Amino acid sequence: KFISAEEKTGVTFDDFAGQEYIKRELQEIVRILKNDEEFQNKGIYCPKGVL
């Protein structure tokens, strides 16, 4: 009973810069996850594990 099932943490994308390519790639990943049906209409599938 230790896993923090959080919803908000208070840290946004603007606080971390210098890797805007990584920010764009992570934005694409989370946008694919949230907007799944629109891109699965085109057959797009998200990666399951991001390291």
Partner: protein, 96 residues
Amino acid sequence: VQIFGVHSAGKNLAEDIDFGKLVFRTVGFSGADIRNLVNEAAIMSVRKGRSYIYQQDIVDVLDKQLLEGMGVLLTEEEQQKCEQSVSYEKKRLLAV
């Protein structure tokens, strides 16, 4: 080529797409790698607002993977300014 056709059958391909002129760029690729390549081309197709996936999407995907392979993660603007930062003669030597 057959695996590229099989794994990209359920996608909206353009008319200029032909994988026969990129077989030399995919030496050693497995079926999972070709599937990942097709998904990569689809993702950078929808990222640029494109409706279809031409050959240039696959070329850009392969080129960006090759650029990332030596550890270069740069967007267009920073690449342009860093190209402009270098002088002319010391670029002229690399040109020759």
